[PDB]
Amino acid sequence: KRQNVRTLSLIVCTFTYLLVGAAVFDALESDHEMREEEKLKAEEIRIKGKYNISSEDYRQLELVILQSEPHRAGVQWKFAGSFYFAITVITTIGYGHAAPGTDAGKAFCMFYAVLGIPLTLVMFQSLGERMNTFVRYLLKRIKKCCDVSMENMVTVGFFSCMGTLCIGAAAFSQCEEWSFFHAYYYCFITLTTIGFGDYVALQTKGALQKKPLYVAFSFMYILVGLTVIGAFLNLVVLRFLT
Amino acid sequence: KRQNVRTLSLIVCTFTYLLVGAAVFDALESDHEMREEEKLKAEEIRIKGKYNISSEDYRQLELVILQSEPHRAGVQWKFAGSFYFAITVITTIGYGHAAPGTDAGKAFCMFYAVLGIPLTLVMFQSLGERMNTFVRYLLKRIKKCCDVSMENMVTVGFFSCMGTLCIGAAAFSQCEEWSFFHAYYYCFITLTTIGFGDYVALQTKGALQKKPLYVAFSFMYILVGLTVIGAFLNLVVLRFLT
Ligand SMILES: CC(C)CCC[C@@H](C)[C@H]1CC[C@H]2[C@@H]3CC=C4C[C@@H](OC(=O)CCC(=O)O)CC[C@]4(C)[C@H]3CC[C@]12C
Ligand SMILES: CC(C)CCC[C@@H](C)[C@H]1CC[C@H]2[C@@H]3CC=C4C[C@@H](OC(=O)CCC(=O)O)CC[C@]4(C)[C@H]3CC[C@]12C
Ligand SMILES: CC(C)CCC[C@@H](C)[C@H]1CC[C@H]2[C@@H]3CC=C4C[C@@H](OC(=O)CCC(=O)O)CC[C@]4(C)[C@H]3CC[C@]12C
Ligand SMILES: CC(C)CCC[C@@H](C)[C@H]1CC[C@H]2[C@@H]3CC=C4C[C@@H](OC(=O)CCC(=O)O)CC[C@]4(C)[C@H]3CC[C@]12C
Ligand SMILES: CC(C)CCC[C@@H](C)[C@H]1CC[C@H]2[C@@H]3CC=C4C[C@@H](OC(=O)CCC(=O)O)CC[C@]4(C)[C@H]3CC[C@]12C
Ligand SMILES: CC(C)CCC[C@@H](C)[C@H]1CC[C@H]2[C@@H]3CC=C4C[C@@H](OC(=O)CCC(=O)O)CC[C@]4(C)[C@H]3CC[C@]12C
Ligand SMILES: [K+]
Ligand SMILES: [K+]
Ligand SMILES: [K+]
Ligand SMILES: [K+]
Ligand SMILES: [K+]
């Protein structure tokens, strides 16, 4: 029927898109990865030769460094750290900066995610719908001062998304002393609920315990961006769902 | 109105849930984190004292080890690695095992995610609807051999989810030599599109290049679990959306 043809076309398009993306990523990153691996191997070989580090102790040092990486940013299991972890869990971001080490803790986290994901999704959908209604009312008032089409709403939403991304990138560049492009990429990754974890905020000089205002601003910005993303998805994506 | 009261109640419930989760996580993980940090500091101090490692070179060693961690699993930017990265990107998992190192690569990844997320969501929704229809038909045929209620469908979906999770956990425990509970936790994390990245498959002894069958099975299992999760969300969660 129509549904079978539609889903077959969707599957074929998804497979072709995946193949094209994999080919482009390989062709763009193979040489860079090879050069980085060669440089790292040369550096580690030189360091091992200079310090005469035993092979057996090298694995222990690597394990210790890997396990102590989250602890180098301070205490990640305080009230602020626990709140950040809960926010990441409920939003399905998965930064990976801190993970439970207890089986009971893992089970509690699983139950927490199960009981919290639908509630967060419903709240985000409602907030996005309310924001869309408010934006439509504001646009109508502006037009009266100076009917609304779907293209105008789409353009307004895209402009709002771009402005929010630019504001977040500028704020993160000013706070964490990051590059503008890097801050923009990190903001885009955070707002898409992907969570690569390469760039994690509130992980420098113990900012989670000495800068409550920065933490509050980051939480507010994350919530606002998530609401904007949900509103945009409702405006453009949810229409093709049912 | 009703919508304002509903969204205010949702926000209050979400805030209370976040506070409770943060309090429980802190009370459960503070002592464990303190003990782990103390043990790691003692071990690193002992190693530094034994090897007389200079403080300046310690930072260089830490940076080299952190940068070379993905490369220890083999070549992560081959065809299989690029396909895995694209699959993680389109599914918003964000494992974080491999990340782009080029600005052009980052921009391409951002555009890829933007152009692929709605398509993947639509395909998953259609596949979940088709699976729900097939399950309803199978249940009707079974009942005839031996009308259907919503509670029966919910129970069948929950049982299917539990069976899929158990099968995935058993397969991952048999393949990667992981614990049953750890495999179950990793499967749950992967199927919820959260992606902590603590446990990543296809990262041992170069399995991405020597075991094509294992990679294909992992891809099929991930797709099947994502389809099951989408079908369950459509059955129980999507009803409260609109
Ligand atoms: C800025 C961002 C949010 C843009 C997102 C783009 C989407 C609006 C596009 C991208 C992929 C598109 C889909 C790609 C393939 C198809 C299959 C297509 O089916 C057919 O052509 C056969 C069945 C029929 O005749 O309807 C129906 C539209 C649909 C779901 C498309 C709907 C619109 C989608 C989701
Ligand atoms: C309507 C649009 C166009 C503009 C929105 C206003 C912004 C320009 C404001 C609103 C909130 C502000 C932020 C609120 C809180 C903080 C934390 C603040 O941090 C501290 O005070 C402690 C750390 C330090 O000493 O820098 C630094 C500024 C910043 C990011 C502010 C930067 C400027 C922001 C983004
Ligand atoms: C309807 C909307 C606008 C409600 C918004 C609520 C915010 C005003 C609240 C919710 C969560 C709060 C945060 C939750 C946790 C913390 C950690 C907390 O840190 C500590 O308790 C330890 C460090 C210290 O002693 O300050 C400082 C306040 C802060 C950032 C809070 C600041 C105020 C926040 C952002
Ligand atoms: C195993 C998993 C799939 C469980 C998923 C649980 C959901 C089915 C629950 C969890 C939170 C619930 C929501 C929590 C709060 C509210 C607000 C509530 O609104 C009111 O009480 C005021 C308005 C009115 O009177 O209807 C309406 C139901 C709703 C959306 C609930 C609908 C059902 C939800 C999404
Ligand atoms: C209907 C339900 C109840 C059962 C579904 C059947 C499973 C028991 C089968 C179907 C697919 C099978 C998997 C397909 C592919 C592989 C890869 C295979 O790996 C290799 O052959 C190479 C690595 C090695 O040497 O172990 C190991 C078995 C495994 C996980 C299989 C384990 C058994 C599985 C999960
Ligand atoms: C309608 C549904 C059932 C379609 C299912 C398609 C699968 C049969 C395809 C899609 C993606 C394929 C995989 C894409 C990439 C790779 C990596 C590839 O590895 C290499 O090319 C290098 C190593 C080697 O030389 O084998 C081996 C095959 C494999 C696992 C493929 C196996 C077959 C897969 C799972
Ligand atoms: K993630
Ligand atoms: K990570
Ligand atoms: K996600
Ligand atoms: K991650
Ligand atoms: K994620």
JSON list of N, CA, C and O in Angstrom, two decimals, chain A residues 2-11 240-242, chain B residues 118-134 226-228 230-231 234 238:
[
{"chain": "A", "resi": 2, "resn": "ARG", "atom": "N", "xyz": [0.23, 2.41, 0.24]},
{"chain": "A", "resi": 2, "resn": "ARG", "atom": "CA", "xyz": [0.97, 3.67, 0.28]},
{"chain": "A", "resi": 2, "resn": "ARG", "atom": "C", "xyz": [1.96, 3.69, 1.43]},
{"chain": "A", "resi": 2, "resn": "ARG", "atom": "O", "xyz": [3.09, 4.18, 1.27]},
{"chain": "A", "resi": 3, "resn": "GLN", "atom": "N", "xyz": [1.56, 3.18, 2.59]},
{"chain": "A", "resi": 3, "resn": "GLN", "atom": "CA", "xyz": [2.45, 3.20, 3.76]},
{"chain": "A", "resi": 3, "resn": "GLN", "atom": "C", "xyz": [3.69, 2.34, 3.52]},
{"chain": "A", "resi": 3, "resn": "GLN", "atom": "O", "xyz": [4.80, 2.73, 3.91]},
{"chain": "A", "resi": 4, "resn": "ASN", "atom": "N", "xyz": [3.53, 1.17, 2.90]},
{"chain": "A", "resi": 4, "resn": "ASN", "atom": "CA", "xyz": [4.67, 0.31, 2.63]},
{"chain": "A", "resi": 4, "resn": "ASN", "atom": "C", "xyz": [5.65, 0.97, 1.68]},
{"chain": "A", "resi": 4, "resn": "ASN", "atom": "O", "xyz": [6.87, 0.93, 1.90]},
{"chain": "A", "resi": 5, "resn": "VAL", "atom": "N", "xyz": [5.15, 1.58, 0.61]},
{"chain": "A", "resi": 5, "resn": "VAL", "atom": "CA", "xyz": [6.02, 2.28, -0.33]},
{"chain": "A", "resi": 5, "resn": "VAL", "atom": "C", "xyz": [6.72, 3.44, 0.35]},
{"chain": "A", "resi": 5, "resn": "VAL", "atom": "O", "xyz": [7.92, 3.68, 0.15]},
{"chain": "A", "resi": 6, "resn": "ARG", "atom": "N", "xyz": [5.99, 4.19, 1.18]},
{"chain": "A", "resi": 6, "resn": "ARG", "atom": "CA", "xyz": [6.57, 5.33, 1.87]},
{"chain": "A", "resi": 6, "resn": "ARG", "atom": "C", "xyz": [7.69, 4.90, 2.81]},
{"chain": "A", "resi": 6, "resn": "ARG", "atom": "O", "xyz": [8.77, 5.50, 2.82]},
{"chain": "A", "resi": 7, "resn": "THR", "atom": "N", "xyz": [7.46, 3.84, 3.59]},
{"chain": "A", "resi": 7, "resn": "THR", "atom": "CA", "xyz": [8.50, 3.40, 4.52]},
{"chain": "A", "resi": 7, "resn": "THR", "atom": "C", "xyz": [9.68, 2.76, 3.80]},
{"chain": "A", "resi": 7, "resn": "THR", "atom": "O", "xyz": [10.82, 2.91, 4.24]},
{"chain": "A", "resi": 8, "resn": "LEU", "atom": "N", "xyz": [9.44, 2.08, 2.67]},
{"chain": "A", "resi": 8, "resn": "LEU", "atom": "CA", "xyz": [10.55, 1.55, 1.89]},
{"chain": "A", "resi": 8, "resn": "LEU", "atom": "C", "xyz": [11.40, 2.68, 1.32]},
{"chain": "A", "resi": 8, "resn": "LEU", "atom": "O", "xyz": [12.63, 2.61, 1.34]},
{"chain": "A", "resi": 9, "resn": "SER", "atom": "N", "xyz": [10.75, 3.74, 0.81]},
{"chain": "A", "resi": 9, "resn": "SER", "atom": "CA", "xyz": [11.49, 4.89, 0.31]},
{"chain": "A", "resi": 9, "resn": "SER", "atom": "C", "xyz": [12.27, 5.57, 1.43]},
{"chain": "A", "resi": 9, "resn": "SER", "atom": "O", "xyz": [13.42, 5.98, 1.23]},
{"chain": "A", "resi": 10, "resn": "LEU", "atom": "N", "xyz": [11.66, 5.69, 2.61]},
{"chain": "A", "resi": 10, "resn": "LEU", "atom": "CA", "xyz": [12.37, 6.28, 3.75]},
{"chain": "A", "resi": 10, "resn": "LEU", "atom": "C", "xyz": [13.59, 5.45, 4.13]},
{"chain": "A", "resi": 10, "resn": "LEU", "atom": "O", "xyz": [14.66, 6.01, 4.40]},
{"chain": "A", "resi": 11, "resn": "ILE", "atom": "N", "xyz": [13.45, 4.12, 4.15]},
{"chain": "A", "resi": 11, "resn": "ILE", "atom": "CA", "xyz": [14.58, 3.26, 4.50]},
{"chain": "A", "resi": 11, "resn": "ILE", "atom": "C", "xyz": [15.69, 3.38, 3.46]},
{"chain": "A", "resi": 11, "resn": "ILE", "atom": "O", "xyz": [16.87, 3.47, 3.81]},
{"chain": "A", "resi": 240, "resn": "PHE", "atom": "N", "xyz": [4.52, 16.11, 9.96]},
{"chain": "A", "resi": 240, "resn": "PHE", "atom": "CA", "xyz": [4.68, 14.92, 9.14]},
{"chain": "A", "resi": 240, "resn": "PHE", "atom": "C", "xyz": [4.57, 13.63, 9.94]},
{"chain": "A", "resi": 240, "resn": "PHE", "atom": "O", "xyz": [4.66, 12.54, 9.36]},
{"chain": "A", "resi": 241, "resn": "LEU", "atom": "N", "xyz": [4.38, 13.71, 11.26]},
{"chain": "A", "resi": 241, "resn": "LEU", "atom": "CA", "xyz": [4.28, 12.51, 12.08]},
{"chain": "A", "resi": 241, "resn": "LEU", "atom": "C", "xyz": [2.91, 11.84, 11.91]},
{"chain": "A", "resi": 241, "resn": "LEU", "atom": "O", "xyz": [2.83, 10.68, 11.51]},
{"chain": "A", "resi": 242, "resn": "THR", "atom": "N", "xyz": [1.84, 12.57, 12.22]},
{"chain": "A", "resi": 242, "resn": "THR", "atom": "CA", "xyz": [0.49, 12.03, 12.10]},
{"chain": "A", "resi": 242, "resn": "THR", "atom": "C", "xyz": [-0.43, 13.01, 11.38]},
{"chain": "A", "resi": 242, "resn": "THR", "atom": "O", "xyz": [-0.82, 12.78, 10.24]},
{"chain": "B", "resi": 118, "resn": "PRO", "atom": "N", "xyz": [15.30, 14.69, 11.45]},
{"chain": "B", "resi": 118, "resn": "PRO", "atom": "CA", "xyz": [13.87, 14.51, 11.15]},
{"chain": "B", "resi": 118, "resn": "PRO", "atom": "C", "xyz": [13.57, 13.30, 10.30]},
{"chain": "B", "resi": 118, "resn": "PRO", "atom": "O", "xyz": [12.55, 12.63, 10.51]},
{"chain": "B", "resi": 119, "resn": "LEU", "atom": "N", "xyz": [14.43, 12.99, 9.33]},
{"chain": "B", "resi": 119, "resn": "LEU", "atom": "CA", "xyz": [14.21, 11.82, 8.48]},
{"chain": "B", "resi": 119, "resn": "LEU", "atom": "C", "xyz": [14.26, 10.53, 9.30]},
{"chain": "B", "resi": 119, "resn": "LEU", "atom": "O", "xyz": [13.41, 9.65, 9.15]},
{"chain": "B", "resi": 120, "resn": "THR", "atom": "N", "xyz": [15.26, 10.42, 10.19]},
{"chain": "B", "resi": 120, "resn": "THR", "atom": "CA", "xyz": [15.36, 9.25, 11.05]},
{"chain": "B", "resi": 120, "resn": "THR", "atom": "C", "xyz": [14.16, 9.15, 11.98]},
{"chain": "B", "resi": 120, "resn": "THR", "atom": "O", "xyz": [13.63, 8.06, 12.22]},
{"chain": "B", "resi": 121, "resn": "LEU", "atom": "N", "xyz": [13.72, 10.28, 12.53]},
{"chain": "B", "resi": 121, "resn": "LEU", "atom": "CA", "xyz": [12.55, 10.27, 13.41]},
{"chain": "B", "resi": 121, "resn": "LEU", "atom": "C", "xyz": [11.30, 9.80, 12.67]},
{"chain": "B", "resi": 121, "resn": "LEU", "atom": "O", "xyz": [10.54, 8.98, 13.20]},
{"chain": "B", "resi": 122, "resn": "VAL", "atom": "N", "xyz": [11.09, 10.30, 11.45]},
{"chain": "B", "resi": 122, "resn": "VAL", "atom": "CA", "xyz": [9.92, 9.90, 10.68]},
{"chain": "B", "resi": 122, "resn": "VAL", "atom": "C", "xyz": [9.98, 8.42, 10.33]},
{"chain": "B", "resi": 122, "resn": "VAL", "atom": "O", "xyz": [8.98, 7.69, 10.43]},
{"chain": "B", "resi": 123, "resn": "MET", "atom": "N", "xyz": [11.16, 7.94, 9.92]},
{"chain": "B", "resi": 123, "resn": "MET", "atom": "CA", "xyz": [11.31, 6.53, 9.58]},
{"chain": "B", "resi": 123, "resn": "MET", "atom": "C", "xyz": [11.05, 5.64, 10.80]},
{"chain": "B", "resi": 123, "resn": "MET", "atom": "O", "xyz": [10.38, 4.61, 10.70]},
{"chain": "B", "resi": 124, "resn": "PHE", "atom": "N", "xyz": [11.58, 6.03, 11.96]},
{"chain": "B", "resi": 124, "resn": "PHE", "atom": "CA", "xyz": [11.37, 5.26, 13.18]},
{"chain": "B", "resi": 124, "resn": "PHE", "atom": "C", "xyz": [9.90, 5.25, 13.57]},
{"chain": "B", "resi": 124, "resn": "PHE", "atom": "O", "xyz": [9.37, 4.22, 13.99]},
{"chain": "B", "resi": 125, "resn": "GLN", "atom": "N", "xyz": [9.22, 6.39, 13.44]},
{"chain": "B", "resi": 125, "resn": "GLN", "atom": "CA", "xyz": [7.79, 6.44, 13.76]},
{"chain": "B", "resi": 125, "resn": "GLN", "atom": "C", "xyz": [6.99, 5.54, 12.83]},
{"chain": "B", "resi": 125, "resn": "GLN", "atom": "O", "xyz": [6.10, 4.81, 13.29]},
{"chain": "B", "resi": 126, "resn": "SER", "atom": "N", "xyz": [7.29, 5.57, 11.53]},
{"chain": "B", "resi": 126, "resn": "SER", "atom": "CA", "xyz": [6.57, 4.71, 10.59]},
{"chain": "B", "resi": 126, "resn": "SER", "atom": "C", "xyz": [6.82, 3.24, 10.88]},
{"chain": "B", "resi": 126, "resn": "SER", "atom": "O", "xyz": [5.89, 2.42, 10.85]},
{"chain": "B", "resi": 127, "resn": "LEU", "atom": "N", "xyz": [8.08, 2.88, 11.16]},
{"chain": "B", "resi": 127, "resn": "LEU", "atom": "CA", "xyz": [8.40, 1.49, 11.47]},
{"chain": "B", "resi": 127, "resn": "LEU", "atom": "C", "xyz": [7.72, 1.04, 12.75]},
{"chain": "B", "resi": 127, "resn": "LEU", "atom": "O", "xyz": [7.23, -0.09, 12.84]},
{"chain": "B", "resi": 128, "resn": "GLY", "atom": "N", "xyz": [7.66, 1.92, 13.76]},
{"chain": "B", "resi": 128, "resn": "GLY", "atom": "CA", "xyz": [6.97, 1.58, 14.99]},
{"chain": "B", "resi": 128, "resn": "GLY", "atom": "C", "xyz": [5.48, 1.38, 14.78]},
{"chain": "B", "resi": 128, "resn": "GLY", "atom": "O", "xyz": [4.88, 0.47, 15.36]},
{"chain": "B", "resi": 129, "resn": "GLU", "atom": "N", "xyz": [4.86, 2.24, 13.97]},
{"chain": "B", "resi": 129, "resn": "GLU", "atom": "CA", "xyz": [3.44, 2.07, 13.66]},
{"chain": "B", "resi": 129, "resn": "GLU", "atom": "C", "xyz": [3.19, 0.75, 12.94]},
{"chain": "B", "resi": 129, "resn": "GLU", "atom": "O", "xyz": [2.23, 0.03, 13.25]},
{"chain": "B", "resi": 130, "resn": "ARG", "atom": "N", "xyz": [4.04, 0.42, 11.97]},
{"chain": "B", "resi": 130, "resn": "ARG", "atom": "CA", "xyz": [3.88, -0.85, 11.25]},
{"chain": "B", "resi": 130, "resn": "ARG", "atom": "C", "xyz": [4.06, -2.04, 12.19]},
{"chain": "B", "resi": 130, "resn": "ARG", "atom": "O", "xyz": [3.31, -3.02, 12.11]},
{"chain": "B", "resi": 131, "resn": "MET", "atom": "N", "xyz": [5.05, -1.97, 13.09]},
{"chain": "B", "resi": 131, "resn": "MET", "atom": "CA", "xyz": [5.26, -3.05, 14.04]},
{"chain": "B", "resi": 131, "resn": "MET", "atom": "C", "xyz": [4.08, -3.18, 14.99]},
{"chain": "B", "resi": 131, "resn": "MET", "atom": "O", "xyz": [3.68, -4.30, 15.35]},
{"chain": "B", "resi": 132, "resn": "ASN", "atom": "N", "xyz": [3.51, -2.06, 15.43]},
{"chain": "B", "resi": 132, "resn": "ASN", "atom": "CA", "xyz": [2.33, -2.11, 16.29]},
{"chain": "B", "resi": 132, "resn": "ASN", "atom": "C", "xyz": [1.15, -2.75, 15.58]},
{"chain": "B", "resi": 132, "resn": "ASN", "atom": "O", "xyz": [0.43, -3.56, 16.17]},
{"chain": "B", "resi": 133, "resn": "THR", "atom": "N", "xyz": [0.94, -2.40, 14.31]},
{"chain": "B", "resi": 133, "resn": "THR", "atom": "CA", "xyz": [-0.13, -3.02, 13.54]},
{"chain": "B", "resi": 133, "resn": "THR", "atom": "C", "xyz": [0.09, -4.53, 13.39]},
{"chain": "B", "resi": 133, "resn": "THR", "atom": "O", "xyz": [-0.85, -5.32, 13.54]},
{"chain": "B", "resi": 134, "resn": "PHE", "atom": "N", "xyz": [1.33, -4.93, 13.10]},
{"chain": "B", "resi": 134, "resn": "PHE", "atom": "CA", "xyz": [1.64, -6.35, 12.96]},
{"chain": "B", "resi": 134, "resn": "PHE", "atom": "C", "xyz": [1.43, -7.09, 14.28]},
{"chain": "B", "resi": 134, "resn": "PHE", "atom": "O", "xyz": [0.91, -8.22, 14.29]},
{"chain": "B", "resi": 226, "resn": "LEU", "atom": "N", "xyz": [15.68, 0.29, 18.62]},
{"chain": "B", "resi": 226, "resn": "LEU", "atom": "CA", "xyz": [15.17, 1.65, 18.40]},
{"chain": "B", "resi": 226, "resn": "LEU", "atom": "C", "xyz": [13.75, 1.62, 17.86]},
{"chain": "B", "resi": 226, "resn": "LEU", "atom": "O", "xyz": [12.91, 2.42, 18.27]},
{"chain": "B", "resi": 227, "resn": "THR", "atom": "N", "xyz": [13.46, 0.70, 16.93]},
{"chain": "B", "resi": 227, "resn": "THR", "atom": "CA", "xyz": [12.10, 0.57, 16.42]},
{"chain": "B", "resi": 227, "resn": "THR", "atom": "C", "xyz": [11.13, 0.16, 17.52]},
{"chain": "B", "resi": 227, "resn": "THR", "atom": "O", "xyz": [10.01, 0.68, 17.59]},
{"chain": "B", "resi": 228, "resn": "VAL", "atom": "N", "xyz": [11.54, -0.77, 18.38]},
{"chain": "B", "resi": 228, "resn": "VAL", "atom": "CA", "xyz": [10.68, -1.19, 19.49]},
{"chain": "B", "resi": 228, "resn": "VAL", "atom": "C", "xyz": [10.42, -0.03, 20.44]},
{"chain": "B", "resi": 228, "resn": "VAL", "atom": "O", "xyz": [9.29, 0.17, 20.90]},
{"chain": "B", "resi": 230, "resn": "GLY", "atom": "N", "xyz": [10.51, 3.18, 19.72]},
{"chain": "B", "resi": 230, "resn": "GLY", "atom": "CA", "xyz": [9.62, 4.12, 19.06]},
{"chain": "B", "resi": 230, "resn": "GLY", "atom": "C", "xyz": [8.18, 3.64, 19.05]},
{"chain": "B", "resi": 230, "resn": "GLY", "atom": "O", "xyz": [7.25, 4.43, 19.25]},
{"chain": "B", "resi": 231, "resn": "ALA", "atom": "N", "xyz": [7.97, 2.34, 18.82]},
{"chain": "B", "resi": 231, "resn": "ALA", "atom": "CA", "xyz": [6.62, 1.79, 18.86]},
{"chain": "B", "resi": 231, "resn": "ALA", "atom": "C", "xyz": [6.01, 1.92, 20.24]},
{"chain": "B", "resi": 231, "resn": "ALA", "atom": "O", "xyz": [4.84, 2.28, 20.38]},
{"chain": "B", "resi": 234, "resn": "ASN", "atom": "N", "xyz": [5.07, 5.55, 20.79]},
{"chain": "B", "resi": 234, "resn": "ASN", "atom": "CA", "xyz": [3.84, 5.85, 20.08]},
{"chain": "B", "resi": 234, "resn": "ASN", "atom": "C", "xyz": [2.63, 5.27, 20.80]},
{"chain": "B", "resi": 234, "resn": "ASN", "atom": "O", "xyz": [1.57, 5.90, 20.86]},
{"chain": "B", "resi": 238, "resn": "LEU", "atom": "N", "xyz": [2.93, 9.02, 22.91]},
{"chain": "B", "resi": 238, "resn": "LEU", "atom": "CA", "xyz": [2.42, 9.92, 21.88]},
{"chain": "B", "resi": 238, "resn": "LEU", "atom": "C", "xyz": [0.95, 10.26, 22.08]},
{"chain": "B", "resi": 238, "resn": "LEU", "atom": "O", "xyz": [0.51, 11.31, 21.59]}
]
